[PDB]
Design an enzyme around this catalytic site. Structure first.
Site, PDB file in Angstrom:
ATOM      1  N   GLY A 285      42.380  22.803  39.050  1.00 60.61           N
ATOM      2  CA  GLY A 285      40.959  23.081  39.111  1.00 60.61           C
ATOM      3  C   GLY A 285      40.092  22.017  38.470  1.00 60.61           C
ATOM      4  O   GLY A 285      38.974  22.304  38.032  1.00 60.61           O
TER       5      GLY A 285
ATOM      6  N   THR B 195      38.800  19.171  39.937  1.00 55.15           N
ATOM      7  CA  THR B 195      37.674  18.864  40.814  1.00 55.15           C
ATOM      8  C   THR B 195      36.666  20.005  40.825  1.00 55.15           C
ATOM      9  O   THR B 195      35.451  19.771  40.807  1.00 55.15           O
ATOM     10  CB  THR B 195      38.169  18.576  42.233  1.00 55.15           C
ATOM     11  OG1 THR B 195      39.074  17.465  42.212  1.00 55.15           O
ATOM     12  CG2 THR B 195      36.999  18.251  43.152  1.00 55.15           C
TER      13      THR B 195
ATOM     14  N   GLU C  88      39.506  10.281  45.238  1.00 56.17           N
ATOM     15  CA  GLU C  88      40.497  10.784  46.198  1.00 56.17           C
ATOM     16  C   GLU C  88      39.805  11.370  47.426  1.00 56.17           C
ATOM     17  O   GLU C  88      40.042  10.930  48.555  1.00 56.17           O
ATOM     18  CB  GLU C  88      41.407  11.813  45.523  1.00 56.17           C
ATOM     19  CG  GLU C  88      42.361  12.517  46.473  1.00 56.17           C
ATOM     20  CD  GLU C  88      43.381  11.578  47.084  1.00 56.17           C
ATOM     21  OE1 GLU C  88      43.698  10.546  46.455  1.00 56.17           O
ATOM     22  OE2 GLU C  88      43.865  11.873  48.197  1.00 56.17           O
TER      23      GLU C  88
ATOM     24  N   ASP D 277      35.596  33.099  44.433  1.00 57.25           N
ATOM     25  CA  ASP D 277      34.606  32.599  45.380  1.00 57.25           C
ATOM     26  C   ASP D 277      33.384  32.012  44.687  1.00 57.25           C
ATOM     27  O   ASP D 277      32.653  31.230  45.304  1.00 57.25           O
ATOM     28  CB  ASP D 277      34.175  33.720  46.328  1.00 57.25           C
ATOM     29  CG  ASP D 277      35.333  34.285  47.126  1.00 57.25           C
ATOM     30  OD1 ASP D 277      36.256  33.514  47.462  1.00 57.25           O
ATOM     31  OD2 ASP D 277      35.322  35.500  47.414  1.00 57.25           O
TER      32      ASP D 277
ATOM     33  N   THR E   1      56.952  59.849  34.451  1.00 57.41           N
ATOM     34  CA  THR E   1      56.606  60.011  35.856  1.00 57.41           C
ATOM     35  C   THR E   1      56.607  61.485  36.242  1.00 57.41           C
ATOM     36  O   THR E   1      57.516  62.239  35.884  1.00 57.41           O
ATOM     37  CB  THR E   1      57.587  59.238  36.739  1.00 57.41           C
ATOM     38  OG1 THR E   1      58.925  59.671  36.463  1.00 57.41           O
ATOM     39  CG2 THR E   1      57.481  57.746  36.476  1.00 57.41           C
TER      40      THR E   1
ATOM     41  N   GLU F 204      49.919  52.658  42.062  1.00 54.24           N
ATOM     42  CA  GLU F 204      51.167  53.310  42.432  1.00 54.24           C
ATOM     43  C   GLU F 204      51.084  54.062  43.753  1.00 54.24           C
ATOM     44  O   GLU F 204      52.128  54.418  44.309  1.00 54.24           O
ATOM     45  CB  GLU F 204      51.605  54.283  41.330  1.00 54.24           C
ATOM     46  CG  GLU F 204      51.972  53.622  40.015  1.00 54.24           C
ATOM     47  CD  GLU F 204      52.280  54.632  38.929  1.00 54.24           C
ATOM     48  OE1 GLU F 204      51.854  55.798  39.064  1.00 54.24           O
ATOM     49  OE2 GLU F 204      52.948  54.261  37.942  1.00 54.24           O
TER      50      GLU F 204
HETATM   51  N1  LIG Z   1      37.285  29.227  47.691  1.00 53.17           N
HETATM   52  C1  LIG Z   1      38.364  29.218  46.903  1.00 53.17           C
HETATM   53  N2  LIG Z   1      38.878  30.402  46.503  1.00 53.17           N
HETATM   54  C2  LIG Z   1      39.956  30.400  45.714  1.00 53.17           C
HETATM   55  N3  LIG Z   1      40.643  29.360  45.238  1.00 53.17           N
HETATM   56  C3  LIG Z   1      40.113  28.203  45.650  1.00 53.17           C
HETATM   57  C4  LIG Z   1      39.003  28.044  46.462  1.00 53.17           C
HETATM   58  N4  LIG Z   1      38.745  26.698  46.681  1.00 53.17           N
HETATM   59  C5  LIG Z   1      39.687  26.088  46.004  1.00 53.17           C
HETATM   60  N5  LIG Z   1      40.549  26.935  45.357  1.00 53.17           N
HETATM   61  C6  LIG Z   1      41.693  26.567  44.531  1.00 53.17           C
HETATM   62  O1  LIG Z   1      41.309  25.518  43.673  1.00 53.17           O
HETATM   63  C7  LIG Z   1      42.520  24.853  43.277  1.00 53.17           C
HETATM   64  C8  LIG Z   1      42.188  23.503  42.696  1.00 53.17           C
HETATM   65  O2  LIG Z   1      41.458  22.737  43.677  1.00 53.17           O
HETATM   66  P1  LIG Z   1      40.908  21.296  43.344  1.00 53.17           P
HETATM   67  O3  LIG Z   1      40.314  20.653  44.534  1.00 53.17           O
HETATM   68  O4  LIG Z   1      39.981  21.410  42.134  1.00 53.17           O
HETATM   69  O5  LIG Z   1      42.210  20.515  42.864  1.00 53.17           O
HETATM   70  P2  LIG Z   1      42.623  19.590  41.635  1.00 53.17           P
HETATM   71  O6  LIG Z   1      42.997  20.378  40.442  1.00 53.17           O
HETATM   72  O7  LIG Z   1      41.501  18.569  41.439  1.00 53.17           O
HETATM   73  O8  LIG Z   1      43.866  18.802  42.232  1.00 53.17           O
HETATM   74  P3  LIG Z   1      44.299  17.309  42.609  1.00 53.17           P
HETATM   75  O9  LIG Z   1      43.918  16.363  41.522  1.00 53.17           O
HETATM   76  O10 LIG Z   1      45.811  17.394  42.843  1.00 53.17           O
HETATM   77  O11 LIG Z   1      43.593  17.029  43.942  1.00 53.17           O
HETATM   78  C9  LIG Z   1      43.376  24.827  44.540  1.00 53.17           C
HETATM   79  O12 LIG Z   1      44.760  24.914  44.220  1.00 53.17           O
HETATM   80  C10 LIG Z   1      42.903  26.062  45.329  1.00 53.17           C
HETATM   81  O13 LIG Z   1      43.910  27.064  45.382  1.00 53.17           O
HETATM   82  N1  LIG Z   2      50.297  71.082  45.293  1.00 45.78           N
HETATM   83  C1  LIG Z   2      51.021  70.907  44.183  1.00 45.78           C
HETATM   84  N2  LIG Z   2      51.465  72.000  43.526  1.00 45.78           N
HETATM   85  C2  LIG Z   2      52.189  71.834  42.417  1.00 45.78           C
HETATM   86  N3  LIG Z   2      52.562  70.697  41.824  1.00 45.78           N
HETATM   87  C3  LIG Z   2      52.110  69.633  42.495  1.00 45.78           C
HETATM   88  C4  LIG Z   2      51.351  69.644  43.654  1.00 45.78           C
HETATM   89  N4  LIG Z   2      51.065  68.352  44.067  1.00 45.78           N
HETATM   90  C5  LIG Z   2      51.648  67.602  43.162  1.00 45.78           C
HETATM   91  N5  LIG Z   2      52.297  68.309  42.183  1.00 45.78           N
HETATM   92  C6  LIG Z   2      53.034  67.769  41.046  1.00 45.78           C
HETATM   93  O1  LIG Z   2      52.477  66.521  40.709  1.00 45.78           O
HETATM   94  C7  LIG Z   2      53.489  65.786  40.001  1.00 45.78           C
HETATM   95  C8  LIG Z   2      53.136  64.321  40.011  1.00 45.78           C
HETATM   96  O2  LIG Z   2      51.793  64.199  39.499  1.00 45.78           O
HETATM   97  P1  LIG Z   2      50.995  62.841  39.600  1.00 45.78           P
HETATM   98  O3  LIG Z   2      50.630  62.522  40.995  1.00 45.78           O
HETATM   99  O4  LIG Z   2      49.828  62.929  38.617  1.00 45.78           O
HETATM  100  O5  LIG Z   2      52.017  61.772  39.012  1.00 45.78           O
HETATM  101  P2  LIG Z   2      52.169  60.923  37.674  1.00 45.78           P
HETATM  102  O6  LIG Z   2      52.559  61.772  36.530  1.00 45.78           O
HETATM  103  O7  LIG Z   2      50.887  60.110  37.502  1.00 45.78           O
HETATM  104  O8  LIG Z   2      53.320  59.902  38.068  1.00 45.78           O
HETATM  105  P3  LIG Z   2      53.662  58.823  39.194  1.00 45.78           P
HETATM  106  O9  LIG Z   2      52.434  58.452  39.954  1.00 45.78           O
HETATM  107  O10 LIG Z   2      54.286  57.653  38.427  1.00 45.78           O
HETATM  108  O11 LIG Z   2      54.738  59.492  40.054  1.00 45.78           O
HETATM  109  C9  LIG Z   2      54.800  66.146  40.696  1.00 45.78           C
HETATM  110  O12 LIG Z   2      55.869  66.201  39.758  1.00 45.78           O
HETATM  111  C10 LIG Z   2      54.524  67.526  41.321  1.00 45.78           C
HETATM  112  O13 LIG Z   2      55.319  68.542  40.721  1.00 45.78           O
HETATM  113 MG   LIG Z   3      50.452  58.264  39.801  1.00 45.15          MG
HETATM  114 MG   LIG Z   4      40.909  15.562  43.259  1.00 43.38          MG
END
Ligand SMILES: Nc1ncnc2c1ncn2[C@@H]1O[C@H](COP(=O)(O)OP(=O)(O)OP(=O)(O)O)[C@@H](O)[C@H]1O
Ligand SMILES: Nc1ncnc2c1ncn2[C@@H]1O[C@H](COP(=O)(O)OP(=O)(O)OP(=O)(O)O)[C@@H](O)[C@H]1O
Ligand SMILES: [Mg+2]
Ligand SMILES: [Mg+2]
Ligand SMILES: Nc1ncnc2c1ncn2[C@@H]1O[C@H](COP(=O)(O)OP(=O)(O)OP(=O)(O)O)[C@@H](O)[C@H]1O
Ligand SMILES: Nc1ncnc2c1ncn2[C@@H]1O[C@H](COP(=O)(O)OP(=O)(O)OP(=O)(O)O)[C@@H](O)[C@H]1O
Ligand SMILES: Nc1ncnc2c1ncn2[C@@H]1O[C@H](COP(=O)(O)OP(=O)(O)OP(=O)(O)O)[C@@H](O)[C@H]1O
Ligand SMILES: Nc1ncnc2c1ncn2[C@@H]1O[C@H](COP(=O)(O)OP(=O)(O)OP(=O)(O)O)[C@@H](O)[C@H]1O
Ligand SMILES: [Mg+2]
Ligand SMILES: [Mg+2]
Ligand SMILES: [Mg+2]
Ligand SMILES: [Mg+2]
Lengths: 463, 463, 463
Positions: free
Chosen positions: B35, B37, B61, B212, B256, B284
């Site tokens: 980054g 440039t 360049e 951006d 979970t 998740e």
């Molecule tokens: N619109 C954009 N959105 C997200 N990332 C961008 C965008 N435009 C450029 N980049 C990222 O910017 C990074 C660096 O770009 P830049 O032209 O500054 O290179 P640099 O570090 O001067 O490299 P060099 O000296 O090798 O040419 C790029 O790897 C690219 O992924």
């Molecule tokens: N209609 C329902 N009646 C009874 N129990 C329900 C119902 N819908 C979901 N569950 C219960 O919801 C539990 C999961 O809850 P939840 O979606 O909040 O998950 P969590 O604890 O955030 O975990 P993870 O997303 O990692 O699985 C399940 O074990 C299930 O028994």
């Molecule tokens: Mg969950």
């Molecule tokens: Mg350059």
């Protein structure tokens, strides 16, 4: 914004956010045998096939006959494309080379150019400044002509300098890295977009595989419904509030010998009984052993396999990497179009691999299953058969929707089994942990251990 | 003290304690694609926009057309600035270069100068002494002219020499380092101010993101009040002494399937019910799965989303780094102006990352939430579903203000749930751990386990 | 013995056992931005200020105007010293240089000489033998003239060769190393005396900081009395045999939400109530949150802060290194002259740092508190809220004099708190562990858990 030419390579346009920028040079650098020549050939081939855009492939190491012979293994008839004039293969085994490339572009109306190895030309010079100057000249001339060019270069070390001379990265507008990492005596192919001038992209390394169709990159809004499928065991459906969901992912985890393969076999048998196609991926047992065990359980897999309803794919986990297993599973799913997929053991695939890689594999497989609306039955083996408190050795619980827990319980000096519905997303389920039995007729589910305490530790105490 | 020219780059003036010193040279060194440039372009662009100070950008360049085309992706119309005379782009693709730069500064009344790559000029010489001498000449002449100059140089290794020749650091008054660290197949961008002659600065590496709008550096007196918001569950408000605080941060941690997502959904639904805008970051579950689960709980998210009250942002934790997730959350908060923000799982964001990085991310998110007076509902997943004694795998307990604990309790052979108000800063709360139920109508809170001992271990004993 | 010229740099004369030897050359080597120029300037400045000894500073990289401008940020008016003739600044941007230095020494009666960078002169030669020969000539001539000289040289790697050419160590009589170690994205400054010919010194690396007053090196017979201060809680004083000692160090350790900040706030409030000045260093909460929590506890911090009795210093632990926090604490103690100092959390300062560094920080802070006869109230957060057997994650128990233990106890399904006087050096204390309550009026101490067993594990059993 910058207009991007879709490379049509599977998974590449996802990470590049629309493909390679039009009119800008992309340098793909990697060690020997990473897939640079395959990438450059597939770029032009997919361009010609999908958009009728002529391609020019300039080669330095391999002869054109060798290029066509190698491509023929992928089903790519480059010879007929050369005859049709869609594809041109320039032989170069620097100004004169650029003039000849420009003439080829003009004559064949080329839209895409691939350069197999500019490093072989740079071998003539030892100074990195000269390499940088000549590469800048080449890239500037290619941009002036307006042809999207994909050059490839060589690397000595996987984790080190991006290119041989250390100056190719500062010249080319776009930089892509192919790595073939050797770790634990296992090879893994990774793809990393280092720098895209002017546009955003995904950052980091993503696994990719080389198959009979070429490069298949895995670039790591799922729909849901209330349709409920039948597992195969009536008690396991009653406990789950009316069976699993169609889009649900079910993970049955427990120690060795608790009955995970029995549940998987019943799942597949119930899938095929309702005239649905099912796939069983086996990693701990062979086909004949599975058939014998099913026969001991009163289930005829041979009849359902003859009807082309059940497809049993058996392989050793050590025969291929996790990304290769994912690619094989996806290919089999595409070829067979199954309603249900089952995996004999995820822990078998988890042997000798890092937690992050296994988690990535599980995430990919579950996401693909949910996207394709395929009911997946995964299983996991716990390291400890008693006293285990972590659900899985590698934490994949958050990924799954429904979890079944199988465990050993020592009662009266006998090793009984216990089954429990740990969780179900979006559905009520029974909370009791019930006695689980295996007999010649299959699995049976009995009353719960109401009279015991500390059942989870595996050594309960009657109260 | 030394007068400092504010670069106006988001977060840079915080670490530099007022910006770059006026009249002194700053060398920004980094590998390809870090980054440099973008940094040099944004310096001049922000100077012109905020203080009408003319800028001169000397390039080696990229061509000026390429520079403008790349800048156009950020919305920066450099062409109209060149037409207006505010910005000048010198093409240099050493004494003559300095004379031309001085002439450009005199003609356009330039206050800021940027040099894209002095390394390309230094490629002509191999001796580090010559590079040091010529860089000293350039810096001395720039100081004599009195123009604040930002030059950039190239690095070969992320953790190694600060510059290519190892002598650029001893010449320039100010040294800044851009690093693109590749670890665990993941890329992380870091910014480190190495040396500021004559002034103090923050020390170490701080993450930054390219979006951006350009570079958004995160440079890691919160107000408090007695206004109490409603969580959505009446029992959870009674237990909390009258609901959460408006400026409080609530972390609900458990295994979970204990109901963290249910509490998050009720939080969002109660936020939108009172005509307040809410944001739900999901990691998740997908949007459709969340909708189906809410429908199973009797909550219509579709109606509240149509009213533009609830914004659901869903993405995979592996799709971007932790700093990228923080930037996305901040951008969504700025765009939507929410009263409440909820996160489906911090442990999902904690996959495959170091403890320190996750703690930094949590600190940043909580500090931004408190600064913006936004009620945040974080959740955490424990590795062990029973017997867990550490509240969180990565210690973030000190950061949060209110903690809710959900756990599994095995009673009578059934997996019941327990909920407890672990702590509340500045408010009385109930100490009892109460039975927690989930049904079609949502969550229910019942009496406490007065008749049991060792409830925390997950395997209590009736006494 | 060898006569030693006191450098007057804070902490340097302690490790050097009286200062740099008189008439012998000292070479201070380090990477860019370590503090070599600051060290050489401070040497001459402190010599002139404390002993009227004229100093000569020979510079190669920075101009004399730049040197004076940089020094002005420290309050050092080098221009008036040049006008007074006490300080001379020779510009050299080898025999002629030595002749000019000798002439400057003779004319200004210089007693101390500083050489900013002899490496820049050595850049002209590539052979290490020539560098060694010329450095030997320079050191021999400096010794013959009899002026104590401090030259500085450059390093490429923190942990590697001591100097650029690898021969500077074998020439100079005295060798000092400045290191700027980057670890965990954090920078730490260290000072190490490698070799002092003819005299003993402290061995190893010791942290140092650069502040507005220059270098403050920390070179890691405390008095005792029977005067007893009041903590603020009458029950906590009765349990401690009549309150804490004036010179005692008190560490209150426990889980999150057990009441450490409440005890700290009561300590500060009792300090200010008796018209004593107190300092509260906060790292887990902001000033406004502390005010709100104190108001919830019935304590008005605003009134005591308006009277300039209480000073609340709040900062994030990640904003600076441990040595920087120690320097800030020492500076605030010197500026405010407090009777009592309290720290909101040592575990907050312990985030993402090694055990040895945290132990060194604790030792330094406690030693400074005991030396200044300041009552210190430290607090520590335990990783596990129940079942913890290690008093602190990083063993600092031996350092402290009085230890208070706060813990969670699950009784009747409710999370009560327990407080105990673990130890008190030189005083009788109550051994019982008593119930601890928090209400609108503050903390309350109730009877002990006489009816329970295994109270320490956090899950007792009624007997
Ligand atoms: N619109 C954009 N959105 C997200 N990332 C961008 C965008 N435009 C450029 N980049 C990222 O910017 C990074 C660096 O770009 P830049 O032209 O500054 O290179 P640099 O570090 O001067 O490299 P060099 O000296 O090798 O040419 C790029 O790897 C690219 O992924
Ligand atoms: N209609 C329902 N009646 C009874 N129990 C329900 C119902 N819908 C979901 N569950 C219960 O919801 C539990 C999961 O809850 P939840 O979606 O909040 O998950 P969590 O604890 O955030 O975990 P993870 O997303 O990692 O699985 C399940 O074990 C299930 O028994
Ligand atoms: Mg969950
Ligand atoms: Mg350059
Ligand atoms: N039909 C195929 N099926 C599977 N793998 C294949 C097939 N054809 C080629 N490969 C694999 O493609 C890999 C890369 O081949 P390619 O010709 O692209 O080499 P490269 O990366 O350009 O190497 P170099 O520059 O050293 O010649 C080979 O290591 C080979 O294992
Ligand atoms: N005919 C049968 N009658 C009773 N029990 C049987 C019968 N056939 C197999 N079993 C039981 O099946 C158990 C193993 O079940 P299964 O094939 O599902 O294994 P698993 O739990 O998936 O583990 P793994 O494949 O790692 O060994 C054995 O412990 C055995 O007691
Ligand atoms: N007023 C100040 N407050 C805090 N830090 C300061 C102050 N002035 C200078 N510094 C710090 O002093 C450090 C060392 O500055 P100095 O001029 O001594 O460099 P040096 O070690 O001689 O480096 P080089 O040989 O590369 O020029 C700088 O990195 C800067 O951060
Ligand atoms: N007005 C109040 N009435 C009752 N209890 C209160 C009141 N205000 C705060 N508390 C209690 O204070 C506890 C936290 O105390 P404190 O601020 O000392 O935290 P701590 O133990 O130092 O931990 P940390 O700062 O890491 O969260 C909470 O658990 C809460 O129950
Ligand atoms: Mg090849
Ligand atoms: Mg099996
Ligand atoms: Mg210097
Ligand atoms: Mg606190």
């Amino acid at each position: 914004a910058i207009a991007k030419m879709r490379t049509m390579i599977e998974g590449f346009d996802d990470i590049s956010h629309g493909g390679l920028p039009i009119g800008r040079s992309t340098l793909v650098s990697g060690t020997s045998g990473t897939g640079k020549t395959l990438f450059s050939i597939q770029f032009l081939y997919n361009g010609i096939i999908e958009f009728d855009e002529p391609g020019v492939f300039v080669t330095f190491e391999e002869t054109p006959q060798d290029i066509i012979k190698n491509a023929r293994s992928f089903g790519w008839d480059l010879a007929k494309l050369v005859d049709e004039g869609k594809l041109f293969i320039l032989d170069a085994s620097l100004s004169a080379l650029i003039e000849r490339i420009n003439y080829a572009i003009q004559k064949y109306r080329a839209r895409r150019v691939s350069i197999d190895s500019v490093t072989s030309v740079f071998q003539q010079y030892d100074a990195s400044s000269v390499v940088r100057r000549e590469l800048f000249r080449l890239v500037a001339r290619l941009k002036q002509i307006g042809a999207t060019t994909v050059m490839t270069t060589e690397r000595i070390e996987e984790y080190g300098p991006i290119a041989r001379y250390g100056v190719e990265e500062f010249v080319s507008d776009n930089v892509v890295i192919l790595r073939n990492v050797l770790e634990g005596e296992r090879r893994r192919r990774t793809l990393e977009i280092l720098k895209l001038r002017g546009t955003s992209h995904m950052k980091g390394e993503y696994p990719f595989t080389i198959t009979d169709h070429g490069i298949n990159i895995f670039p790591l809004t799922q729909r849901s419904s209330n349709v409920r499928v039948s597992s195969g065991v009536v008690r396991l459906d009653e406990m789950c509030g009316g069976g699993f969901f169609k889009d649900s992912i079910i993970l049955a985890t427990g120690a060795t010998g608790t009955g995970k393969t029995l549940l998987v076999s019943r799942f597949v048998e119930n899938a095929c009984a309702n005239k649905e196609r099912a796939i069983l991926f086996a990693y701990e047992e062979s086909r004949a052993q599975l058939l014998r065990n099913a026969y001991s359980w009163g289930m005829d897999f041979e009849e359902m396999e003859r009807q082309n309803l059940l497809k049993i794919v058996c392989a050793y986990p050590e025969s291929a990497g996790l990304e290769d297993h994912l690619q094989i599973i996806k290919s089999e799913i595409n070829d067979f179009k199954p309603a249900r997929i089952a995996i004999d053991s995820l822990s078998a695939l988890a042997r000798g691999v890092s937690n992050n890689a296994f988690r990535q594999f599980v995430i990919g497989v579950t996401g693909y299953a949910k996207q394709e609306e395929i009911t997946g039955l995964f299983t996991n083996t716990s390291d400890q058969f008693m006293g285990a408190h972590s659900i899985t050795d590698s934490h994949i619980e958050e990924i799954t929707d429904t979890i079944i827990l199988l465990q050993y319980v020592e009662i009266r000096g006998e090793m009984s089994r216990a089954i429990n519905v740990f969780k179900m997303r979006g559905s009520w389920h029974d909370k009791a942990i019930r006695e689980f039995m295996i007999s010649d007729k299959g699995p049976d589910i009995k009353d719960s251990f109401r009279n015991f305490e500390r059942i989870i530790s595996g050594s309960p105490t009657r109260i």
